Amino acid sequence: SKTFIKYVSGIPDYFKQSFPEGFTWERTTTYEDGGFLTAHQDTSLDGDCLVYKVKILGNNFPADGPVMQNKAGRWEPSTEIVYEVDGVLRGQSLMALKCPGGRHLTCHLHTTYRSKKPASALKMPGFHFEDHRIEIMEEVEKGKCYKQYEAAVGRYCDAAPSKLGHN
Amino acid sequence: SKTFIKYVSGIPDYFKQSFPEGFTWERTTTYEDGGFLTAHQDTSLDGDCLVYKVKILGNNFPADGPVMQNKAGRWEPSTEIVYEVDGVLRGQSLMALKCPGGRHLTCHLHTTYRSKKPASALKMPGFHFEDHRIEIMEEVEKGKCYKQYEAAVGRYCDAAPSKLGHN
Amino acid sequence: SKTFIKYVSGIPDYFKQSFPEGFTWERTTTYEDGGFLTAHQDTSLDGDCLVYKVKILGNNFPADGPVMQNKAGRWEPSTEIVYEVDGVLRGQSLMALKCPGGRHLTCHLHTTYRSKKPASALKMPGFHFEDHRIEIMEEVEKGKCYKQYEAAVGRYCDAAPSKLGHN
Amino acid sequence: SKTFIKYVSGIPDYFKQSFPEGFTWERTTTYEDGGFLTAHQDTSLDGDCLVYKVKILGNNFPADGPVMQNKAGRWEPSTEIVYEVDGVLRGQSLMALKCPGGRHLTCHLHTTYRSKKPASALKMPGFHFEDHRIEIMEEVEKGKCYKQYEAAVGRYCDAAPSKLGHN
Amino acid sequence: HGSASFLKKTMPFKTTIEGTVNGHYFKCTGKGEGNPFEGTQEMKIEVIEGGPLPFAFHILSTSC
Amino acid sequence: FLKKTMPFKTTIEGTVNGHYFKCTGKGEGNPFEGTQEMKIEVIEGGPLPFAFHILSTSC
Amino acid sequence: HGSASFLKKTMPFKTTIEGTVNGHYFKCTGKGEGNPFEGTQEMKIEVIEGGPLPFAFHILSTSC
Amino acid sequence: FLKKTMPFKTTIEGTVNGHYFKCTGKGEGNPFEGTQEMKIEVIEGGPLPFAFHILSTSC
């Protein structure tokens, strides 16, 4: 849901620029214990309402792992590196599930974001970071119903500045 | 199309044992240049005819690579390792796509095969190899029509025998 | 050179705690184009001076890639996730080489940091982030002599806060 | 110990062609549970005797896994794919360690083999398979003395032949 | 844009999710609202087929 | 339930690098001898903007 | 510690690096100084065997 | 330069999960028949705190 990002430091917003046409994204998440989760998404704008259509194929999750056992606690916050490749945007991030007991199960996200606008009508952002805070606020049902919050920020590595003037 | 395998050395045939119900498989293929190809397939028997239904999600293929450039040569034969995990069948193989310029673009297949029979009804094969020769016999119409041949053999490593009585 | 990190938000300093004994680290960096770089390091304290001893094995770098071609521009800043596993500290990060021309070549770092102190005499930090700004300030010779600066910060994901009170 | 391979079907022997100078190899083995094993080796001929010198760096093996627990069973036979890259030889294989509890712990070998002769002096083999059966014949002394046997065969996929005249 | 007074403060969204994980088919619908420029959002996701999920919902988080 | 020679049929739907496509296919083989041949036709999204080779193991 | 007035402001370091990359053997020595609590440092690395490096120094950055 | 039956010798130095070890080894095989056998002795850092199996392909 990349339309909802606070970009700081003048980093161009690839996603907000893509409208009214919108954008797509494609992703494979590789889990450290062998699971793969692949997804494709279309984002469109229907008047005032964003519309997402998602297709998912997941496989190779171990029967005894936290995912198939439904013993995943919560996501840690994560930071994505986002940069231009092949006239589109690539993203990679490391995410970590904080399982009950304290162990983390990690995964590596490989994403390509594709504008429905041609690259020539877009201001591409430079290499930067995108912080994602994803929290399940309530397990309403099972299994069946979840309330999920996200806060996202597009920024540079401000905490450890360059002494050459690089972002 | 795993129903078509010649098994030798008394190796149980997980796929032929799965009828009339049939089986499914799930796979993620990771390419060395960053592409992913995820597929799910259902295999069923309709009268005398095998019926396959396939869903595919592929992503992160480099725009300048042989795949997206449509400048791939041909598949080398490959050997899958096949063994029981979580009461079902796991497969892994390395495949290599011959490419112009003397290149081999390799990929790593991660497969789970799932009978529609309970594991109780099945004789599970031991760790063994499955040789697959996949060949494009002709490109009938460019990007539109293809003829593809396959020969497959399920076997042990007969070329280099054990000194300890192992398969 | 992990002794030189500014920890904020009260995050315990695993490395500074490890003295006078010191610590070791072990790492495999996997490059997106097939290169592997493996290293082991010992950190000791000789009076007032830190002493590093490093062993390196690197392999599978493509002859035509930016590394073997010596066509690597500069490192982007990076962020490591650091968390406890098996009574020691694990680290993972994604790093990106900004090659001349603008293309990034990425790699994935897999690190274990091991104190020479027993875990019982240590305050282990929770899951957190470690920003690393690594800059080659001068190519003095070839090939032969480099001046390298680093700034490092241990922090939490402050930019996108939890609304549950999680770090 | 690649000098000891039986090559069939007229496949050129990269290793036997490399004498008296000999050859080196470099390898990183990635284990499915996160362990890495990196090795470099020199092979030389001293009189009538082959001399190997090996350097090894291993890391990130889980403390609770079969390797660090020293609860590994035995290696299954394996098949390496071997082909020319950058004027030298690349190998890749998937190996599987039988483990107590019916588990197979798999790993992925990434190898480069380098003759000490120039590529001009060598007849480079085409893409082919190398079957390796590695067996611990006895554990003479626990963690101290081992006897290890290997049989190796360099071959094409004879079990499943081409319909297009390919090897 | 001049100032934030001339920007859309909130924007709603709707989602549809269909997939298979380890052989388990499922379908979800979702509804939510977020602040585009503040970068915050919340949504409610409902499993409409294949519920209750025999796997951790967490693996779908980045997809909804 | 299986014979010396068996026909098969496939339908394939997918997206690769944002490119949607649909294929159908008809084939025949000898299941016990382990040989087969099939004809695949791209019915939607053709001609494919990528190498067919990445679909080989999914047919 | 009371205050920063009672902490070590800077601390020197020395390094030795030995390895092989794509069959190329090399040895390095390094010397540097950093501020432990400010988290900044600079060092000079010298290739003493196997120079000039036939590969990008950048792959050694995280190791020195 | 190669014979029907050839001896070999190895020295191995390494660190695995922070554990240092050194091995020596002596072996013999038939290079053209593709068979060999060797004896490996951990001379330093024994007994190994990890499965020997991870060293098999490096001997």
Swiss-Prot record, chains F, H:
Q: Which cysteines are joined by disulfide bonds?
A: none
Lineage: superkingdom: Eukaryota
Protein name as annotated: GFP-like non-fluorescent chromoprotein FP595 chain 1
Look up and give the organism this protein is from: Anemonia sulcata
Residues included from the entire protein = 4 to 62 of 232
